Design an enzyme around this catalytic site. Sequence first.
Site, PDB file in Angstrom:
ATOM      1  N   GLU A  46      14.550  -5.914  -9.594  1.00  0.00           N
ATOM      2  CA  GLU A  46      14.807  -6.900  -8.566  1.00  0.00           C
ATOM      3  C   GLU A  46      13.868  -8.090  -8.695  1.00  0.00           C
ATOM      4  O   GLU A  46      12.752  -7.970  -9.214  1.00  0.00           O
ATOM      5  CB  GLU A  46      14.690  -6.246  -7.183  1.00  0.00           C
ATOM      6  CG  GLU A  46      13.401  -5.476  -6.945  1.00  0.00           C
ATOM      7  CD  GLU A  46      13.523  -4.440  -5.829  1.00  0.00           C
ATOM      8  OE1 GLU A  46      14.180  -3.407  -6.056  1.00  0.00           O
ATOM      9  OE2 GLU A  46      12.971  -4.651  -4.726  1.00  0.00           O
ATOM     10  N   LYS A  48      11.221 -10.913  -7.661  1.00  0.00           N
ATOM     11  CA  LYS A  48      10.105 -10.948  -6.727  1.00  0.00           C
ATOM     12  C   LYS A  48      10.153 -12.317  -6.054  1.00  0.00           C
ATOM     13  O   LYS A  48       9.993 -13.343  -6.718  1.00  0.00           O
ATOM     14  CB  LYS A  48       8.791 -10.780  -7.481  1.00  0.00           C
ATOM     15  CG  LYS A  48       7.603 -10.511  -6.596  1.00  0.00           C
ATOM     16  CD  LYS A  48       6.327 -10.436  -7.414  1.00  0.00           C
ATOM     17  CE  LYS A  48       5.137 -10.095  -6.542  1.00  0.00           C
ATOM     18  NZ  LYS A  48       5.187 -10.847  -5.242  1.00  0.00           N
ATOM     19  N   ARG A  69       1.976  -8.134   6.547  1.00  0.00           N
ATOM     20  CA  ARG A  69       1.348  -7.104   5.734  1.00  0.00           C
ATOM     21  C   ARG A  69      -0.121  -6.892   6.011  1.00  0.00           C
ATOM     22  O   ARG A  69      -0.616  -5.769   5.933  1.00  0.00           O
ATOM     23  CB  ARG A  69       1.520  -7.385   4.247  1.00  0.00           C
ATOM     24  CG  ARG A  69       0.738  -6.410   3.388  1.00  0.00           C
ATOM     25  CD  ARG A  69       1.249  -6.392   1.973  1.00  0.00           C
ATOM     26  NE  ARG A  69       0.429  -5.546   1.119  1.00  0.00           N
ATOM     27  CZ  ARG A  69      -0.847  -5.790   0.849  1.00  0.00           C
ATOM     28  NH1 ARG A  69      -1.434  -6.853   1.376  1.00  0.00           N
ATOM     29  NH2 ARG A  69      -1.532  -4.978   0.052  1.00  0.00           N
ATOM     30  N   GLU A 106      10.602  -9.646   1.933  1.00  0.00           N
ATOM     31  CA  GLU A 106       9.995 -10.970   1.888  1.00  0.00           C
ATOM     32  C   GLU A 106      10.670 -11.935   2.836  1.00  0.00           C
ATOM     33  O   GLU A 106      11.900 -12.003   2.915  1.00  0.00           O
ATOM     34  CB  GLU A 106      10.079 -11.556   0.470  1.00  0.00           C
ATOM     35  CG  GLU A 106       9.124 -10.962  -0.551  1.00  0.00           C
ATOM     36  CD  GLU A 106       7.677 -11.276  -0.232  1.00  0.00           C
ATOM     37  OE1 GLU A 106       7.382 -12.452   0.067  1.00  0.00           O
ATOM     38  OE2 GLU A 106       6.831 -10.357  -0.282  1.00  0.00           O
TER      39      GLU A 106
END
Lengths: 255, 255
Positions: A46, A48, A69, A106
């Site tokens: 995948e 990024k 995060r 994200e």
Amino acid sequence: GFSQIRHEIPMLSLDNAFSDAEFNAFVKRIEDRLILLPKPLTFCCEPKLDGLAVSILYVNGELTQAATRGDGTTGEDITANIRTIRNVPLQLLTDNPPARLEVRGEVFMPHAGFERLNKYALEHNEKTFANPRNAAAGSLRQLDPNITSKRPLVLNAYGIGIAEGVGLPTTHYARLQWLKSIGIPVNPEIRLCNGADEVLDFYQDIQNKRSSLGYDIDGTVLKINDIALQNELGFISKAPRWAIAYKFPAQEELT
Amino acid sequence: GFSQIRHEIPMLSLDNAFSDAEFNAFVKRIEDRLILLPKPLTFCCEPKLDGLAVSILYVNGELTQAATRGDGTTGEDITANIRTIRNVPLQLLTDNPPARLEVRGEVFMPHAGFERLNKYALEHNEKTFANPRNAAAGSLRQLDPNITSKRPLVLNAYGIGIAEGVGLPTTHYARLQWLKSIGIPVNPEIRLCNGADEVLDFYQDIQNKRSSLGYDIDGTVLKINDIALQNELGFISKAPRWAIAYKFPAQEELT
Ligand SMILES: CC(C)(CNC(=O)c1ccc(Oc2ccccc2)cc1)c1ccc2c(N)nc(N)nc2n1
Ligand SMILES: CC(C)(CNC(=O)c1ccc(Oc2ccccc2)cc1)c1ccc2c(N)nc(N)nc2n1
């Protein structure tokens, strides 16, 4: 400031590779480690995305909380900010939502939004954002969720944390497909690959469109598709729970 | 450059605390986690020295190799440099050396040496080292072990990595005492403590002599003394072995 939230499940980081050399190095390291190489090892490949990593919690289908995060172990409560992101569903559609499900991905700002925001900034005497990444982080980490409301953010899921009322498929890719079906957004450039050579192709193909797709792609995260192997392969840990460094206050200058 | 060495056993980092508040926070986190609190929990309390962390390997008593911490997972071969450090024994004295033993600790430069080195530097037109820490790192990481030979470095052990021909005691402190007896250097300020209050005292006492002892002390590392509990307590891991981020080459400027 923002309320602190300790992630029930950690938000680990990743080791990096900047060459096919280091990549195969990574593969080999795995092959040896694995009890028996299935041949030829399948990776969920995948892209990024360039932005900020976030964790969204769904309780019986309802978005109940989200956080940044942080240090990987403690983040900030940005639930309201998250609800303002259109492509983030407030309700998972399944009729059978897990007790609790934690979606991770994200948050980012596509080129069009980024460009528009900065146009406005400049024309209104305000420092422009250096890049979509930074713009995303700021647009999202807002004390006033209304501001975040007006910034063009987008969520692309890549994993799961807590998961209870469910029996998640055995392959990461199968899991992403499940997340799609229940209404969560995931990047469509994700493909499956067998053996380095194949992955390396993915790497090339994506790199040849890291900005052409309308948003910024940092690189590509490569993961072993088989969840069982993942468990087996383990975690390259660091830092014990039985110890801690209690540092003295910084040294002061003379005078 | 230096040959790279992948540590058979990792060289983990530590979480930090800058207040008694955060410290107890750390303790509590442990108590809850532990199946049954022994009451009142004993910590091996040792001073954290300002310098560079290194790993020394002994094969049947003989120093055979040493390396720097690196990223915690891969360091640099600084064996020859290490042999030049006086207080580092070349032969463990026991008649029964483990098959292989890996000693870990801080290499550092005491005030006297640091001051002398810098006096020389200044008086010979050369940038002085900002601190003993930096001076240590440079003095040690030398391609020419002869230079390292002339820098006043000292080793203070704080742990073990590989260990084979042995049955190490059940408590960290017992282990440090064993390392002493077999000839390895360990800081004498290490004391045992029961319960936060007691530890906090250690913290105060050491802080009130972080520079008075003749060398720099960063803070204090607090560890659970009982090795069994350590195993139980675990490791606050981060980063999986089944995945990796293959980043694209940096973005270039216009023109
Ligand atoms: C793979 C993972 C590191 C997520 N995984 C985790 O955070 C994670 C966390 C606990 C896990 O299990 C544990 C549970 C309890 C304790 C320790 C580990 C397993 C994975 C990751 C990180 C960043 C990514 C990114 N920027 N883009 C894409 N496309 N994928 C990414 N994937
Ligand atoms: C406690 C530890 C983090 C070392 N411990 C380790 O490196 C370590 C490494 C693998 C371990 O077990 C594992 C084995 C295999 C895989 C994963 C973990 C356990 C401890 C540490 C770090 C820095 C210190 C410092 N500057 N001063 C003092 N006085 N003590 C210190 N202690």
